[PDB]
Design an enzyme around this catalytic site. Sequence first.
Site, PDB file in Angstrom:
ATOM      1  N   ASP B  25      39.787  70.723   4.677  1.00 15.70           N
ATOM      2  CA  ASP B  25      38.710  71.327   3.894  1.00 15.70           C
ATOM      3  C   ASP B  25      39.237  72.442   2.998  1.00 15.70           C
ATOM      4  O   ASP B  25      39.420  73.579   3.445  1.00 15.70           O
ATOM      5  CB  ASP B  25      37.615  71.848   4.825  1.00 15.70           C
ATOM      6  CG  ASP B  25      36.383  72.304   4.079  1.00 15.70           C
ATOM      7  OD1 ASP B  25      36.411  72.288   2.836  1.00 15.70           O
ATOM      8  OD2 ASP B  25      35.383  72.675   4.728  1.00 15.70           O
ATOM      9  N   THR B  26      39.421  72.119   1.716  1.00 13.88           N
ATOM     10  CA  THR B  26      39.889  73.095   0.744  1.00 13.88           C
ATOM     11  C   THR B  26      38.850  74.166   0.450  1.00 13.88           C
ATOM     12  O   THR B  26      39.194  75.204  -0.127  1.00 13.88           O
ATOM     13  CB  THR B  26      40.279  72.396  -0.562  1.00 13.88           C
ATOM     14  OG1 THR B  26      39.129  71.752  -1.124  1.00 13.88           O
ATOM     15  CG2 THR B  26      41.363  71.363  -0.307  1.00 13.88           C
ATOM     16  N   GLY B  27      37.594  73.938   0.812  1.00 11.01           N
ATOM     17  CA  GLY B  27      36.566  74.934   0.620  1.00 11.01           C
ATOM     18  C   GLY B  27      36.402  75.912   1.756  1.00 11.01           C
ATOM     19  O   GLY B  27      35.533  76.786   1.682  1.00 11.01           O
TER      20      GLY B  27
HETATM   21  C1  LIG Z   1      35.560  82.114   6.278  1.00 13.67           C
HETATM   22  O1  LIG Z   1      35.947  80.837   6.688  1.00 13.67           O
HETATM   23  C2  LIG Z   1      34.992  79.859   6.416  1.00 13.67           C
HETATM   24  C3  LIG Z   1      35.322  78.415   6.763  1.00 13.67           C
HETATM   25  C4  LIG Z   1      34.294  77.337   6.472  1.00 13.67           C
HETATM   26  C5  LIG Z   1      32.958  77.748   5.859  1.00 13.67           C
HETATM   27  S1  LIG Z   1      31.760  76.466   5.506  1.00 13.67           S
HETATM   28  O2  LIG Z   1      31.865  75.414   6.525  1.00 13.67           O
HETATM   29  O3  LIG Z   1      30.396  77.003   5.548  1.00 13.67           O
HETATM   30  N1  LIG Z   1      32.199  75.925   3.959  1.00 13.67           N
HETATM   31  C6  LIG Z   1      32.231  76.965   2.943  1.00 13.67           C
HETATM   32  C7  LIG Z   1      31.720  76.455   1.602  1.00 13.67           C
HETATM   33  C8  LIG Z   1      30.221  76.175   1.658  1.00 13.67           C
HETATM   34  C9  LIG Z   1      32.000  77.550   0.572  1.00 13.67           C
HETATM   35  C10 LIG Z   1      33.203  74.884   3.926  1.00 13.67           C
HETATM   36  C11 LIG Z   1      32.557  73.632   3.343  1.00 13.67           C
HETATM   37  O4  LIG Z   1      33.521  72.653   3.097  1.00 13.67           O
HETATM   38  C12 LIG Z   1      31.552  73.082   4.339  1.00 13.67           C
HETATM   39  C13 LIG Z   1      32.210  72.424   5.541  1.00 13.67           C
HETATM   40  C14 LIG Z   1      31.116  71.766   6.394  1.00 13.67           C
HETATM   41  C15 LIG Z   1      30.147  72.641   7.199  1.00 13.67           C
HETATM   42  C16 LIG Z   1      29.050  71.998   8.051  1.00 13.67           C
HETATM   43  C17 LIG Z   1      28.914  70.476   8.093  1.00 13.67           C
HETATM   44  C18 LIG Z   1      29.869  69.597   7.287  1.00 13.67           C
HETATM   45  C19 LIG Z   1      30.966  70.242   6.436  1.00 13.67           C
HETATM   46  N2  LIG Z   1      30.838  72.024   3.655  1.00 13.67           N
HETATM   47  C20 LIG Z   1      29.448  72.066   3.264  1.00 13.67           C
HETATM   48  O5  LIG Z   1      28.711  72.947   3.549  1.00 13.67           O
HETATM   49  O6  LIG Z   1      29.036  70.966   2.496  1.00 13.67           O
HETATM   50  C21 LIG Z   1      27.586  70.803   2.179  1.00 13.67           C
HETATM   51  C22 LIG Z   1      27.491  70.451   1.007  1.00 13.67           C
HETATM   52  O7  LIG Z   1      27.715  68.943   1.081  1.00 13.67           O
HETATM   53  C23 LIG Z   1      27.242  68.546   2.459  1.00 13.67           C
HETATM   54  O8  LIG Z   1      28.466  67.721   3.201  1.00 13.67           O
HETATM   55  C24 LIG Z   1      28.907  68.456   4.168  1.00 13.67           C
HETATM   56  C25 LIG Z   1      27.763  69.400   4.462  1.00 13.67           C
HETATM   57  C26 LIG Z   1      27.002  69.590   3.085  1.00 13.67           C
HETATM   58  C27 LIG Z   1      32.612  79.185   5.499  1.00 13.67           C
HETATM   59  C28 LIG Z   1      33.648  80.254   5.789  1.00 13.67           C
END
Ligand SMILES: COc1ccc(S(=O)(=O)N(CC(C)C)C[C@@H](O)[C@H](Cc2ccccc2)NC(=O)O[C@H]2CO[C@H]3OCC[C@H]32)cc1
Lengths: 99, 99
Positions: B25-27
Amino acid sequence: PQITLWKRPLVTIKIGGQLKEALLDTGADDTVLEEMNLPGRWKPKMIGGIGGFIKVRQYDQILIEICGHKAIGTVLVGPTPVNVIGRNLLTQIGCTLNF
Amino acid sequence: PQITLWKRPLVTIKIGGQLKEALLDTGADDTVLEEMNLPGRWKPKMIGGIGGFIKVRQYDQILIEICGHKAIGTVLVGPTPVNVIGRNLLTQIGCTLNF
Ligand SMILES: COc1ccc(S(=O)(=O)N(CC(C)C)C[C@@H](O)[C@H](Cc2ccccc2)NC(=O)O[C@H]2CO[C@H]3OCC[C@H]32)cc1
């Protein structure tokens, strides 16, 4: 380009004719942008992230340019903490992970 | 390898003596794993994304093998719906985004 990950993979996008900064987010299925005005019709939808679910406006078939590469697809607009470019558009610009 | 983004970029990881599936996860700034009872000291943290914040336990200097590539760093443990390999470890395995 080849983008390393010691920094956030933030890039410039163009949508609705306006320039913004967004995060290339391989963990996102969908593209979610902060509240903004966009032309045309939308439908209300819900999406879930790490902290729960939010209401978003779903815009279909929207032109969006990402770091110089054109895509046309679904863009969700709502109270996301960050503009995120998800896999629905990353695939269109030919983006892969490599190690 | 090269991983396309048609589907979620899930890979097998090894952590705490367990094999799990996790998203490259690059995000994600940090690595966040589903609840598991790791030994050792931790400290509380709050991380936020779509939907809001969750409380997690921060473990430091944790050994983790990602698709055969060894890494060691900070791992957050909490009620996340998905195992997420964040940039702190992706850099360690040489992962880049390419388009
Ligand atoms: C500080 O360290 C951190 C690590 C990870 C995060 S986070 O998980 O909220 N996020 C952040 C993103 C929304 C900027 C990473 C995104 O890639 C995050 C990873 C994830 C979380 C829950 C369920 C599936 C996938 N992806 C996400 O929110 O995607 C949204 C948008 O598209 C949908 O597919 C997956 C879930 C929905 C936050 C902080």
